[PDB]
Amino acid sequence: AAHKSIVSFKQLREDVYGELLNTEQVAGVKWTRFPELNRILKGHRKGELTVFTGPTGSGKTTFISEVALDLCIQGVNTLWGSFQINNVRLAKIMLTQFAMQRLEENLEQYDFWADKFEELPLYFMTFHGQQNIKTVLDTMQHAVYLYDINHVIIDNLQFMMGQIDKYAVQDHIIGAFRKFATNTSCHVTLIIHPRKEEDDRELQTASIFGSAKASQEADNVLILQEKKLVTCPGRRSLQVTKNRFDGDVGIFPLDFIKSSLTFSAPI
Amino acid sequence: WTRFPELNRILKGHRKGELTVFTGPTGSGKTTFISEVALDLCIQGVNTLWGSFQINNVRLAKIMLTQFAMQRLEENLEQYDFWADKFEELPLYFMTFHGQQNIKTVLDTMQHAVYLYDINHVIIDNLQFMMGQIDKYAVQDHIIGAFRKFATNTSCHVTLIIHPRKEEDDRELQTASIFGSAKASQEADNVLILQEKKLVTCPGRRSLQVTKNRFDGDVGIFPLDFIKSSLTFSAPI
Amino acid sequence: KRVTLWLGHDIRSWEASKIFSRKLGLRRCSLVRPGEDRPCPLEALARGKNLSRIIKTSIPAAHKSIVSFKQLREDVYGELLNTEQVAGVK
DNA sequence: TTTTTTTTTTTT
Ligand SMILES: Nc1ncnc2c1ncn2[C@@H]1O[C@H](COP(=O)(O)OP(=O)(O)OP(=O)(O)O)[C@@H](O)[C@H]1O
Ligand SMILES: Nc1ncnc2c1ncn2[C@@H]1O[C@H](COP(=O)(O)OP(=O)(O)OP(=O)(O)O)[C@@H](O)[C@H]1O
Ligand SMILES: [Mg+2]
Ligand SMILES: [Mg+2]
């Protein structure tokens, strides 16, 4: 009675007590600019993999940038994988979102905001085109070992994966990402494009392009919705279909302030 | 844009390094409108290259010269020399290809022309004609990815004209109607799309929508009218 | 027969080389558009391999890209002349 | 044996 079959609570009781003691530490950093996400996702917890998807040109990158900027203010060290937008335009968008005002109008205040934003724990990767899973993941481990980052975002898996036996390399890379997340306790965010819909159906959790493993092994399936008008549709809606921790599903409308390029509070 | 005031308040201009896709109903005037846009852009600074994979290079040149002349040049051949000479100095180029060609040979000519003429606007007509030759729905994605990589590594505005799938002739063309995989819709920066109001005799009243706009996201439509005499798409009326 | 332009690598030289090639026999002298400097700096910078490969791989002056209304003028004029022949038998 | 993507027929 000494092999790898772990014994009962006689040695696991202490871990359970420790987890139950810090109930406010299991659910980690909360959101400041997003009161709705504080009552749905119950916060941001390390070691979980989440997938993001939405209609074409619906603002997936902009919303993720806002969430990352909100989380990076207090404690979270973030790493950005910009596989679609070059690192300068993304930097402009994030800076404009932080400044809460059109920085192009006033270049005299550029120095102050740049200095105040310079010390935040923000990191980027210079990868822009198609890359294999071996080279990108090595930089992830190297950045974890040095800067101690706890929130990595990859932009458009379909872009990086796109190069055979398709519908299988995607499963391999997403499994590698899940293994890296669980072995290191870093919140990995993935933006996976959906399959071709008919533009009049609400995007369900089964619309993820590829095998079903993406929805199976993910912990949060935050998905955007579009109400296609003829002129400036707006009124984007966000749904949370799956939630492993404290399962809760809900939606809430969002409005877009054009001046600040930020997703305002629900109205 | 100069002849298109509406496009100055929707796409906010023409920017290098972006790939745009054009689509519309069959025989609705996709080639003519693209010709007008390219001619209006090439006037000031833009050096353009044309892919005439459906229309032979003589008819396309005739249409472009008619649009530049703003009148029926066939009526007055005495004025042909003056407008031909005024049209000669414009930085315009074409490719001699007319039939099906693989992506490896057409792309090399683009690089060779970029290295010499410093062009920043290459237009490809009828991607379905170029792709038409297996594993279909995969070569199209490959060539679209190659075009996107070439555009981002060279910073030249690549315009693509892709046919839509077989519609019911009574439904507005959505952004998901692009023939092939959905890679074109996610991967392109502008999804300029034409609309048709099918009448029984000379319908007209073509409508243009902008479903996607990566830079300064704005969506809007504006009707267009066609001056038959000058073969030009006039200002919205 | 096959000349190779070796103008300066800076500005106002590559364009001058293009202009000279256009003035001279087109499709007969290939210009050089490499990232290295002139042959003297290349020899100084130990770029002999570059000076032997890039020069031998010079970009040809012409290509299968038909020109603007310097050619095709006759065909367009002809098609605009016998407009009654564009539409054939009635 | 999954997994998109276009196209014709039948029957909820
Ligand atoms: N709700 C909204 N209302 C108006 N404009 C918006 C809204 N959301 C985003 N935009 C605009 O759309 C532009 C593109 O945004 P973004 O880059 O996030 O799209 P994307 O999700 O990356 O597109 P794709 O899905 O094709 O990659 C932004 O410049 C932004 O100004
Ligand atoms: N709005 C309009 N009203 C009347 N005639 C038009 C209009 N637009 C285009 N045309 C005519 O239709 C003819 C064909 O135009 P064009 O070559 O652009 O079609 P196309 O888009 O190439 O067709 P396809 O989609 O089958 O390739 C032109 O000669 C033009 O005179
Ligand atoms: Mg994006
Ligand atoms: Mg056509």
Author numbering:
A (entry chain E): 242 to 404, 409 to 512
B (entry chain D): 272 to 404, 409 to 512
C (entry chain C): 182 to 271
Copied sentences from the primary study:
Twinkle is a mitochondrial replicative helicase which can self-load onto and unwind mitochondrial DNA.
Thus, the purified E325Q LcTwinkle–DNA–ATP complex from gel filtration was used for cryo-EM analysis. LcTwinkle forms a homo-hexamer wrapping DNA in its central channel. An extended linker connects the NTD and the CTD (N–C linker) in a domain-swapped manner. ATPase sites are located at each of the subunit interfaces, and five ATP molecules can be refined.
